Design a protein around this ligand. Structure first.
Ligand SMILES: Nc1ncnc2c1ncn2[C@@H]1O[C@H](COP(=O)(O)OP(=O)(O)NP(=O)(O)O)[C@@H](O)[C@H]1O
Ligand SMILES: [Mg+2]
Length: 280
C-alpha cells in the first residue's frame, strides 16, 4: 500500500525526541490543524533490495496494517501515515509518562498490588491483541509506556508493533527474534511461533516487576539464550522471601518451555492471583 507523500512538516511541527531504536527515531509532534499532540515514528526504508540497513517495505506494511486494526485503552493507536523516499512516518498516539522501564529504574521494585495494577492492564491489552490473533512478539518493560508517571496507579499502553504478526494458522514460521532476556524458548530454538510466546514474555515481566531482577539474564546474549532454552531460572529467597506463593504460582505457569502447556491469556486472567540480528 502507498501512504501520503506530502511533506510531514507541512502538517505537523516536531519537538523533543521521545526515543529511538534500530529502525526508528520517535519525535513528539503537534498537528497544525488541531493542536493535538502525537508521537511521530520515523522508520528508515531499505535503500536497495538486498540491503541490511533500514526496514523492508513488507515489514513496514505489516506494522502499519496491525496498527490500523487496533483500538483499545491499553494499546497505542495509529493516527495517520506519511512517507517519502527515506522514511515511513507513523503518526502514533502519544504516551507521555515514559517507559515502564524508566519508571522501574527509579525506584526498582514494586509491591504485589502495584505489580498487579500494571499487570492487569498489560493482560487486557494482550487479551485484546490475542483476540484479534495478533502476537506482539516484543513485550518488555521498554515497550510498555505510562500515560502519566506522577499518579499513584498509572495507566499503560503497549507500544512498538515492529515485530507483531497476525497468526492466521495458530503458528507462524517467519523467524522473528526480539531481545534475549524476554524471548520464549521457541524463539530461541527457531521453532514455529504463536500467541503463547507473548505469555512467556509476560512471566518474565512479572518476575522483574516483583523483584527488580531478570530471571534468565546471563553475562552475554548467548548465555541468556541458553538459560532461556533450558528454563534456567529460580525465585531467589533474597528477592522473593516475602512475595506471595500465588504470585510465584502465576509466574511458574507462564515460564513453561512447552507452549501448549503454558497458560493462555484467558487462563492468566482467571488465575486466582489476578481474578478479583540477535547476536553479540
Ligand atoms: N507512541 C509513543 N509515545 C511515546 N513514546 C514512544 C511511542 N512509540 C515509541 N516511543 C519511544 O520510542 C522508542 C522507539 O520506538 P519503537 O516503536 O519502540 O521503535 P523500533 O526501533 O521500531 N523497535 P525497537 O528496536 O524494539 O525499539 C520506544 O522505546 C519509546 O521510548
Ligand atoms: Mg522498540
Amino acid at each position: 500500500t502507498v501512504f501520503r507523500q506530502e511533506n510531514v512538516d507541512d502538517y505537523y511541527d516536531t519537538g523533543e525526541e521521545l526515543g529511538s531504536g534500530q529502525f526508528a527515531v520517535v519525535k513528539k509532534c503537534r498537528e497544525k490543524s488541531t493542536g493535538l499532540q502525537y508521537a511521530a515514528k520515523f522508520i528508515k526504508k531499505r535503500r536497495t533490495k538486498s540491503s541490511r540497513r533500514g526496514v523492508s517495505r513488507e515489514d513496514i506494511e505489516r506494522e502499519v496494517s496491525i496498527l490500523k486494526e487496533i483500538q483499545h485503552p491499553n494499546v497505542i493507536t495509529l493516527h495517520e501515515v506519511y512517507e517519502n523516499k527515506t522514511d515511513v512516518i507513523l503518526i502514533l498516539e502519544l504516551v507521555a509518562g515514559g517507559e515502564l522501564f524508566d519508571f522501574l529504574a527509579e525506584k526498582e521494585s514494586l509491591t504485589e498490588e502495584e505489580a498487579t495494577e500494571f499487570l492487569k492492564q498489560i493482560l487486557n491489552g494482550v487479551y485484546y491483541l490475542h483476540s484479534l490473533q495478533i502476537a506482539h512478539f516484543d513485550l518488555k518493560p521498554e515497550n510498555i509506556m505510562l500515560l502519566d508517571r506522577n499518579v499513584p496507579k498509572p495507566r499503560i499502553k503497549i507500544i512498538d508493533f515492529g515485530l507483531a504478526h497476525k497468526i492466521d494458522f495458530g503458528n507462524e514460521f517467519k523467524n522473528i527474534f526480539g531481545t534475549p532476556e524476554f524471548v520464549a524458548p521457541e524463539i530461541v530454538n527457531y521453532e514455529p511461533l504463536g500467541l503463547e510466546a507473548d505469555m512467556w514474555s509476560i512471566g518474565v515481566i512479572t518476575y522483574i516487576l516483583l523483584s527488580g531482577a531478570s530471571p534468565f539474564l546471563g553475562d552475554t546474549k548467548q548465555e541468556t539464550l541458553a538459560n532461556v532454552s533450558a528454563v534456567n531460572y529460580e525465585f531467589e529467597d533474597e528477592y522473593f522471601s516475602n512475595t506471595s506463593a500465588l504470585a510465584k504460582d502465576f509466574i511458574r505457569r507462564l515460564l513453561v518451555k512447552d507452549p501448549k502447556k503454558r497458560m493462555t491469556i484467558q487462563d492468566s486472567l482467571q488465575h486466582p492471583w489476578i481474578k478479583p540480528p540477535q547476536f553479540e
